Design a binder for this molecule. Sequence first.
Ligand SMILES: Nc1ncnc2c1ncn2[C@@H]1O[C@H](COP(=O)(O)OP(=O)(O)OP(=O)(O)O)[C@@H](O)[C@H]1O
Ligand SMILES: Nc1ncnc2c1ncn2[C@@H]1O[C@H](COP(=O)(O)OP(=O)(O)OP(=O)(O)O)[C@@H](O)[C@H]1O
Ligand SMILES: [Mg+2]
Ligand SMILES: [Mg+2]
Lengths: 343, 343
Amino acid sequence: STGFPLELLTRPATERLAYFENYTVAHPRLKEVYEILMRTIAEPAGASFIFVYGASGVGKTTLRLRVEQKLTELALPKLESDRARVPVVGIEAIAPESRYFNWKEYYTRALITLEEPLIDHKFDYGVRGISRDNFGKINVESKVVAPALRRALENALIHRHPDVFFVDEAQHFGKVASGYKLQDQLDCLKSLANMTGILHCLLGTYELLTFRNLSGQLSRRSVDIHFRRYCADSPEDVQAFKSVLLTFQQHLPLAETPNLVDHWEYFYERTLGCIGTLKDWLKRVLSDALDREATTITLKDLQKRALSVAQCQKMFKEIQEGERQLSETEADVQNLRSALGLG
Amino acid sequence: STGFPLELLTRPATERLAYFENYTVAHPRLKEVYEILMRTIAEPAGASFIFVYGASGVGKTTLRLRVEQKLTELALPKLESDRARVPVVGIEAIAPESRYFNWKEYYTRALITLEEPLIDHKFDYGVRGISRDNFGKINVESKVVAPALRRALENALIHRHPDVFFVDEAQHFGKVASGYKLQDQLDCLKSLANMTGILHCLLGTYELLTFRNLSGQLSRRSVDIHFRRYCADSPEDVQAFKSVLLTFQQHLPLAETPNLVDHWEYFYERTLGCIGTLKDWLKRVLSDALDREATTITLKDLQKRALSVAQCQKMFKEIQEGERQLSETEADVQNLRSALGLG
Ligand SMILES: Nc1ncnc2c1ncn2[C@@H]1O[C@H](COP(=O)(O)OP(=O)(O)OP(=O)(O)O)[C@@H](O)[C@H]1O
Ligand SMILES: Nc1ncnc2c1ncn2[C@@H]1O[C@H](COP(=O)(O)OP(=O)(O)OP(=O)(O)O)[C@@H](O)[C@H]1O
Ligand SMILES: [Mg+2]
Ligand SMILES: [Mg+2]
């Protein structure tokens, strides 16, 4: 069957909720973005950054988890033969309490997350302020200055040599005081990548376009992957969203399968085509309908956990201007030819 | 009976005062908001913030206490088997002495409040500057810097894994020196909730509306619960307020039960429909009556401990602006569909 296992109706509420939460659906936009990211991570070819722009509810974190799992699986059979190598290191950027981004905490937490192998792996990193402990976790004193932590992190990266270096929620890199300091931040990241030869992938919302093409040297070693949502002007995206809604309602662990394709306009209204937001909405609706033990979902149930109109109104405002910066037209190509003299 | 026990008349005034103090009434708005908050807490579904707006007088603190007690009771049967688990942790935000909201005190106070379990729970907090003592109290020195406290708090939250982390008086988060820093504070909170996976509930007055819509990412993961007051324009709210007044006068431990529905316009005028204001005003009147040993209450007595016209006039100005900003109309949906192209 193309739907959920019908045995779940005998199971209690927790099992059905867990099954619905653990389900990952495959849709064309996620598939194409995942394929492009796999291709650009297989060989960087003189690139140090992968910029993955995606709106609030597009699947950035779950895509990162999926690619992390696939990279670990692909590295597994040679990992049995080759040691001193991690497949992938995944970290998330921290929004600082102060006005500027704190690089010392970033470096120490990068060392913490990267350095969790089995205790047999000993390297004796540089600087005397970094070591192991009795629990096997790296201890970092408060007296170590930021360049020392950077040198130790560089040594760890060049030793382990991960395939990619994931920095989730990369929007937090833009919290600085000086207007021009954005270039300096991105150049610091580039310098960290260069000595280690480690491809960095930055995941963030459409705000991350502030780091897009702020320098030509940085523009050369960056790859722009757009995790586009589903539009409404294009009938193809509308049909894709309808099909994904059909797949979701097909696999909902309920006694009566609800009909959802009728109010596709309603579902698009409160999700803007985002897939993670729709999945969370359906999860909350399922939890509500399963607390009352109702054999189905009712419209008013969708109205209960739907996001506020003000919330969805503004999300479109930042998405619409975000896509405008990412819009590539034939006019831009012609100006490139005219500037280059190739006309 | 539907009112206070008649035996309390023989008892001295202290027990009558205590009984009226601990007595709590159930009214439709409080029940609805409590149900919504419990539903949101049970299945956050990728939501890290619950912004519980409400005027000063709606019962936000009492709602928080009731939710805390009910969650503790619900988690008790599972807490019998599984240990090292706190059902719910609640802390109150502190208005800073300086011009900026300090985060070091917030982190250390969250660590103190979160970590008060049975001494058998040992988790060896990160960073060497935080440890236990001879009296079971968390020791935090001035040696540690704010990122170290943040790391220790994050590890403690991950290990304990509370269902929800209540933050009362959340308006104090707005004490900043820069306008963009107001968004930066919420970004820091979002990162803290993301990297630990702990649901954060913000309870505050209508000045919390400055945190309502800012960045699409924050809007996607921020539930809005409105603890609306009882308006006078709608007859249903007037009837509910009159029912609350009637049960309050039924529950007043006096030899003679006064007539309170008659002066419902006055109460309102001096309470604006907030149940907490009515409750504490009646508490003051009853305390005066018990001090005078008077069998009943008079309007005069109400006039003695009422609220000044200037006080209530400032109340309605902030409430009027708070409800105006939170007003969701069908016209607003029309622009959203028109902007989305679904009209
Ligand atoms: N294809 C998918 N299948 C199942 N669940 C998905 C899918 N895409 C997203 N989700 C859900 O979305 C959530 C993960 O967050 P998601 O990656 O969608 O966020 P984002 O909006 O891209 O980023 P951010 O966390 O920065 O706002 C999880 O609840 C996950 O179940
Ligand atoms: N439903 C209720 N039944 C009884 N007493 C209530 C009720 N709601 C509020 N109170 C009273 O209100 C007081 C608690 O403060 P309350 O939560 O009402 O304040 P608030 O205005 O919502 O919040 P804040 O403290 O931020 O101003 C107590 O005196 C409590 O007895
Ligand atoms: Mg995400
Ligand atoms: Mg209160």
